[PDB]
Write a structure and sequence with these properties.
Keywords: oxidoreductase, heme peroxidase, peroxide scavenge, ascorbate peroxidase
CATH class of the largest domain: Mainly Alpha
Order of helices and strands: HHHHHHHEEHHHH
CATH topology of the largest domain: Peroxidase, domain 1
Bound molecules: protoporphyrin IX containing FE
Shape: globular
Entry title: Ascorbate peroxidase from soybean cytosol
Largest sheet: 2 strands, antiparallel
Name: ascorbate peroxidase
Number of helices: 11
PDB class: oxidoreductase
Strand order of the largest sheet: 1-2
Assembly: monomeric
């Protein structure tokens, strides 16, 4: 259902050059998980019924950074500011989604297609649209489905983003990585979810909700057994996420 806007040749040149600069920067700084979180929290505020929120540059606004769900993302915004300044033609909206795409790639994940043209919008969405880690499947559907308009498949695949990074007790309150290899994008999130709780690794209640839901559980099993299928479905879902409200939406 997408009709992507035309952008100028100079805009597309900058996308390509920014993509390369983002790879080097993100790899050097070891901040891929944080940049994935920044892109996801940028996009995940989209409400389909009102066409508000979504990936339109607003996460850099102090008002949106102050949302509790976004604790720590001010670090991400600050980290990208010097690089962004080298690409004045790009929207913040695009830059942050591109950083998200690059974060998945440089940690060994799928190549998520990227289309430019998101405009930076003036008003951040209201607080409280991002998911609550202590809730379960009904909540996940309200947030990903009723609000964002993503599918049950997308929910499970996107939960797989936890294959990189960690929680921090000073940000969410939760603490530690989901996997033994938190800078490697692979299907290990699902493998760990199936094996039970191993000391040192994190499982949120929202992760565990995938195991007991009749639609989510077969997807967890599929992804744990078939990393290729995970990568395919992940790439589809991340593209959709990154394009909520954009290019028809
Ligand atoms: C399904 C509902 C979700 C819940 C409840 C949730 C919740 C959380 C929480 C509580 C944290 C820890 C923040 C911190 O303390 O530093 C976190 C981190 C993270 N989340 Fe999720 N998340 C969800 C979905 C997603 C999605 C869809 C993605 C991207 C596809 C994602 C990517 C990440 C990443 C990469 C981190 C690690 C950040 C870092 O290492 O600094 N999450 N999430």
């Amino acid at each position: 259902g997408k009709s992507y806007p035309t952008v100028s040749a100079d805009y597309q040149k900058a996308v390509e050059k920014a993509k390369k600069k983002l790879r080097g920067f993100i790899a050097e700084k070891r901040c891929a998980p944080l940049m994935l979180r920044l892109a996801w929290h940028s996009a995940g505020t989209f409400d389909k019924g009102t066409k508000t929120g979504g990936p339109f540059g607003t996460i850099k606004h102090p008002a949106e950074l102050a949302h509790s769900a976004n604790n720590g993302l001010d670090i991400a915004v600050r980290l990208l500011e010097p690089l962004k300044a080298e690409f004045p033609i790009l929207s913040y909206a695009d830059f942050y989604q591109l950083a998200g795409v690059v974060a998945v790639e440089v940690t060994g994940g799928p190549e998520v297609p990227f289309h430019p043209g998101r405009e930076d919008k003036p008003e951040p969405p209201p607080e409280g649209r991002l998911p609550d880690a202590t809730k379960g499947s009904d909540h996940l559907r309200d947030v990903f489905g009723k609000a964002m308009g993503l599918t049950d498949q997308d929910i499970v695949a996107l939960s797989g983003g936890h294959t990189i990074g960690a929680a921090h007790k000073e940000r969410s309150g939760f603490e530690g990585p989901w996997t033994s290899n938190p800078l490697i994008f692979d299907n290990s999130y699902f493998t760990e979810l199936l094996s039970g709780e191993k000391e040192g690794l994190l499982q949120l209640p929202s992760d565990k909700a995938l195991l007991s839901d009749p639609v989510f559980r077969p997807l967890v099993d599929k992804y744990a057994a078939d990393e290729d299928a995970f990568f395919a479905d992940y790439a589809e879902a991340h593209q959709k996420l990154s394009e909520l409200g954009f290019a028809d939406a």
